[PDB]
Amino acid sequence: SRVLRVVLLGAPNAGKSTLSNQLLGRKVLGVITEKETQVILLDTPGIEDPWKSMESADLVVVLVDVSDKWTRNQLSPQLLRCLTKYSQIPSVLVMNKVDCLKQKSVLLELTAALTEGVVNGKKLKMRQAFHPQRIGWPHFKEIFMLSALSQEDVKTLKQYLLTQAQPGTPEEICANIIREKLLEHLPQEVPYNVQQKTAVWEEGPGGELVIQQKLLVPKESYVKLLIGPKGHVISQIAQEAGHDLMDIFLCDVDIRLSVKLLK
């Protein structure tokens, strides 16, 4: 039995939750059990919780959103303080959202910027044609370049983490799936203002799960956005949600969504 505790740190929109969902295999602390290895993912908010999580870290995964031209060129000072206080813990660099780049050769330069030209205690020796606030971190053990959305190279990180192991309610699920679909389909703050209340949750005559949920919103514009043109959007949501529930409960699900204004 081998165990690893991996703390994911990074900028707020670095995709930490995205990588956690892909690596866990489900869109959900996380636990991954494979053969004799157990990996405990600690997903922390972006920059007290990161520090408290890193207190119990066997490994650190430092995320950089390479598509963000503003922050891709440097690590945040708070993050650098965090590794410095916990320099004993091994750290790995993950460059996320590589798919968003026109020019992949860009990552080359960023590596030199982000690792300060040093990795795993080794130097880079690179000649050229002819011929203080820290910005990077020189104690990275390894570097990975991946895209969270497309699952690109995520498996390599999974195997690496596995090898690094050292000696050692249904209604809520339905609401979470509906919230996921609302977030995916609705714009701006609308999905954050939708209140869900269950109207019906029963077993139909044919053994299916009859679900009737009420989506309550404070504004009529939110109602219009939820319903969408000719009721398409909501219908799509319901349909997709039902499919996911059909997989989760392993039974037929008849889900009906209704939109009402908060009085």
Partner: protein, 208 residues
């Protein structure tokens, strides 16, 4: 090119045509029927339906030619094979009973195993940006490492430190060293495998 685009390369394999029609899958049958409508290029001088044909030895011989002198290169290749054979026979005769079971006397087996023992798995490919040609480790394709084994053997045998020792004698000695995982070519493979382990910073660039 003097051949039009519609011309296709010939297939010299002889046992290929002797497969019974019964075995032929629908896809292979369709391929065979398609081949009848195409033009086929004239078979080049070289490969033949012979049972002694060896494409690896042919490629090694081609890599040894200088200035189109194929007769000399083939002469050197056959001399090297005969030298390896005679050396193995000498070592077999002088060996005791239980060591005669582990002495190889087929020169083709020795040549193929010697080249296989020198193949590198990983190499470095430079990539251009910023004025700095970035050296990233890369898993070499099979064809690439097959070429590199042969090139390293030939360049090792062409060294000027070996004064007046004829090419067949140098080449047979190097081949028999590489057969036993010894010599400078094996060290050249090792000094690439360690020098690519020394640069595993850029080990995940998968778009060379």
């Amino acid at each position: 090119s003097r051949y039009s685009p519609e011309f296709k390369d010939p297939l010299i394999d002889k046992e290929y045509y002797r497969k019974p029609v019964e075995e032929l899958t629908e896809e292979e049958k369709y391929v065979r029927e398609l081949k009848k409508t195409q033009l086929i290029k004239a078979a080049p001088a070289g490969k033949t339906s012979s049972v002694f044909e060896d494409p690896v030895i042919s490629k090694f011989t081609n890599m040894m030619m200088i200035g189109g002198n194929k007769v000399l290169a083939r002469s050197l290749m056959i001399q090297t094979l005969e030298a390896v054979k005679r050396k193995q026979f000498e070592k077999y005769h002088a060996a005791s009973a239980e060591e005669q079971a582990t002495i190889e006397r087929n020169p083709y087996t020795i040549f193929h195993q010697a080249l296989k023992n020198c193949e590198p798995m990983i190499g470095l490919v430079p990539i251009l940006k910023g004025g700095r040609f970035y050296q990233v480790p890369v898993p070499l394709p099979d064809r690439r490492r097959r070429f590199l084994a042969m090139k390293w053997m030939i360049t090792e045998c062409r060294d000027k430190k070996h004064q007046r020792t004829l090419m067949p004698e140098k080449l047979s000695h190097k081949l028999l060293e590489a057969f036993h995982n010894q010599g400078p070519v094996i060290k050249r493979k090792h000094d690439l495998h360690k020098m690519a382990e020394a640069n595993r910073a850029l080990a995940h660039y998968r778009w060379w």
